[PDB]
Every structure is written in structure tokens, then in C-alpha cells.
């Protein structure tokens, strides 16, 4: 329930995006959506410190016009609650590259052929204080 | 016709906002709107290099729910077309403080008693690549 929303970000492939923010002291739930339309998101992040009864578990999936989405499961968490961290996100038509402030890199195939990113929304226990383009 | 739009910026008085961007090579028209609702903007900027037949002329006014607005006229332009520049904007309930990358400072009374900024939109010949909070 805490994250700024952006629009008109028209991001093309081959560009790097860096976001620096501060994770609340109670990092329990986060929601991210970066695509073009609300139901047409290319990437979705939803880490959960402890919801039903799990720990440091991350869910990642994509949606097309509210159709479906290949939701996977990532079990890596190089961050702690109440800690400032930056995440590098690169969206390319060939594939998606994402790196953490302290970890390796993970790529996800972009079944969609979107060449521009126009929708970017984030709301959760994470606080974004600045957005940088390339 | 070129400027990203932001939302959920809930900015309180006593905070400084810095925006770094790049002005297109044809800096002819710019539009800015920072308030809470589309018709409830507290500050509006609209510099015009040459429209009807004027030069480096800036118009500044405020609106409340689409009611009225004390539009004034500022004739200062410490910038050139095709040039990167940063502008510091501070919104306080006592008054509004605005400084340019190379110039003095100008304050405008905020007849409205808005304690938080939730709407921020900019579209024109200026390009914003990063937004920084305090």
C-alpha cells in the first residue's frame, strides 16, 4: 500500500533503468507492474516475506490484456527489511535482464513483442524516492 | 507533446524536489501541472520561445477545481534550447520557493492551503530523464 505510479515512460529495448528507493522496516508485501496497459504488463514482481506461511519467496509472471501469464518462482532475497536498495531493470525484445544490488542475474523470455514500455506502477512495503533513466 | 506524468507523489511542505532533464533542441513550448487533481493544480508553468510573436516569455498561474487562477508574467530565461538543465522546486504552505540552475529565486503565494502534492504532470519540448525526492 505504498509505491508511486508512473506513466508515459515509453522505454525502448537496449536501454537500462535504475531505481533507488527505501524498503519499509516491515517489508512484507510488494507489487510491481511495468508494461503498457493495466492488463498488458510484461513483468510483475510480488515478493512476500510471510503471507500464508512462507518466507523470502518471490513470484514473477507476465500478463497480456488480462489473458494468462507464465508465473514462475524465484527463491533469492539479497535484501532485508528497513534497508535502502537499488534494482537495475533492462527490458529488451530479445529477453529481459534483471540484476539485484547483491546477487546474480536472471533472464525471462518476453513472449510478447512489445517494443516500448508505457505503464509502470509499484505499490507495497517498498518506497521509491527517485527514478533514473539509462 | 513530450513529458512524463507522475502520480501518488504525496509531497508535504518543507520538502525539496529536484528534477534533472534535457530540453529538446526546439524548446518552443512546455506545460507543467503539479497539484492534487487535474483541475486543482497549485502551480502551472508555460514558457514560450515564440508562439503568437513573442520571445523568452513565461506564464505562471494556479487553478482550483477549474475555478480561476492568478496568472502572472515572468520574463527570465536562464536556459537555451537543446541544453540539459535542472530546476529545484519546493512547495511549502507558507509560500512556494522555486530556483533555476542559473538565476535568482521567485516566490508565489499559495492561496490554497493544500498540505500534500499528489498530481504532477509535464508535457512539452522538455524531456525529464530522472526525478529526485528531497
Curated annotation (Swiss-Prot), chains A, B:
Which tissues express it? Answer: Expressed in placenta, maternal decidua and fetal membranes. Within placenta, expressed in trophoblasts, stromal cells, villous endothelium, syncytiotrophoblast apical membrane and villous stroma. Within fetal membranes, expressed in amnion, chorioamniotic mesenchyma and chorion (at protein level). Expressed in cardiac, smooth, and skeletal muscle, neurons, thymus, kidney and hematopoietic cells.
What InterPro entries does the record tag this protein with? Answer: ConA-like_dom_sf, Galectin-like, Galectin_CRD
Report the record's Gene Ontology biological process terms. apoptotic process; cell-cell adhesion; myoblast differentiation; negative regulation of T-helper 17 cell lineage commitment; plasma cell differentiation; positive regulation of apoptotic process; positive regulation of canonical NF-kappaB signal transduction; positive regulation of inflammatory response
Residues modified to N-acetylalanine: 1
Post-translational modification Phosphoserine, affected residues? 29
A Pfam family matched in the record: Gal-bind_lectin
Q: Which residues are annotated as modified residue N6-succinyllysine in the UniProt record? A: 107
In which compartments does the protein localize? Secreted, Extracellular space, Extracellular matrix; Cytoplasm; Secreted
Q: What role is this protein assigned?
A: Lectin that binds beta-galactoside and a wide array of complex carbohydrates. Plays a role in regulating apoptosis, cell proliferation and cell differentiation. Inhibits CD45 protein phosphatase activity and therefore the dephosphorylation of Lyn kinase. Strong inducer of T-cell apoptosis. Plays a negative role in Th17 cell differentiation via activation of the receptor CD69.
Protein name per its UniProtKB record:
Galectin-1
What is the protein's species of origin? Answer: Homo sapiens (Human)
Origin organism lineage: Eukaryota, Metazoa, Chordata, Craniata, Vertebrata
